[model samples]
Target: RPESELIRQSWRVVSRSPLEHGTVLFARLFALEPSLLPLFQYNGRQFSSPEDSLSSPEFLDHIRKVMLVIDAAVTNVEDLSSLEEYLTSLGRKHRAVGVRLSSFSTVGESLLYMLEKSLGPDFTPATRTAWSRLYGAVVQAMSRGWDG
Candidate 1:
């Protein structure tokens, strides 16, 4: 599928501060699913809650890793095989944390919310659709390994 220019270009704005955007995404994720908080704990060791340690180096490292995947997805939106490989590996890791396939929808919703907030008036219907398509592809690819 041809990547929508709007989606690719809009992602550039988020990419400018990938770490910031990543943390924002995680904030929304945790807010939406407080139970998932245990999934991130600064290398399975956090004296404080994930929410409180968002600014710590360990949390920042997690944020950077997430952005790296997002960057790769945006850069190679047309290549499902590559995206699948990466997301599959991610899914395998997430499985240990009890991540389910349905959780991807929640993550996608939060992502769109972040994009809209960041883009403001620039976020149009077409852009939303483009992001939805890209996110859907990601979720689909990741699902392959979720059950492994």
Candidate 2:
């Protein structure tokens, strides 16, 4: 229960500026998995470089989508099953788009990096553990698509 509040409390600051904070996430993601850069396709083309992705409107929109999804998870932290069908369908959508489920692990790591960077001194060990488990639950919901 305390951890749940830690999630809510920590997320408050980052949610205020989703795009600005989400950019920090993508920056970390691309550095960790350069191959993931190609998954972000617009107009049937990939960005020449990760820096190029930062400049594209469509890519930026995807960043917003990511932030919103994380927001949705936070909104339903106490009961993740509420999002089971929605997130499972979302996983199928990404699968159709050539996104590997394994890539979510990389995404999760990037999220931690973003939160730590944003929260700085406020990013306590407890908060990081709370967010980490929450993302794992979201991915668990998404994982249903792959097996079926």
Top TM-score: which candidate number? 2
Write the residue-wise lDDT of candidate 2 on 1-148 in tens digits: 8988999999999999999999999999999999888887889998989999999999999999999999999988999999999999999888988889999999999999999999999999999999999999999989887866
Candidate 2 segments exceeding 4 Å error: none
lDDT of 2: 0.93
lDDT of 1 by residue, 1-148 (tens): 4346787889989999988888788889877877676656555664345467576787778778878887888888776577788788788778776777787888998899899889999999889998998888888778878664
Q: For each candidate, C-alpha RMSD in Å? A: 2.1, 0.9
Spell out the clash pairs found in candidate 2.
Answer: none
Q: How far is candidate 1 from the true structure (C-alpha RMSD, Å)?
A: 2.1
Ten residues in sequence with the least summed lDDT for candidate 2: 139-148
Q: 32 in model 1: Cα distance from truth in Å?
A: 1.0
Per-candidate TM equals: 0.88, 0.97
CA lDDT of every candidate = 0.80, 0.93
**Clash totals for all models, in order?**
0, 0
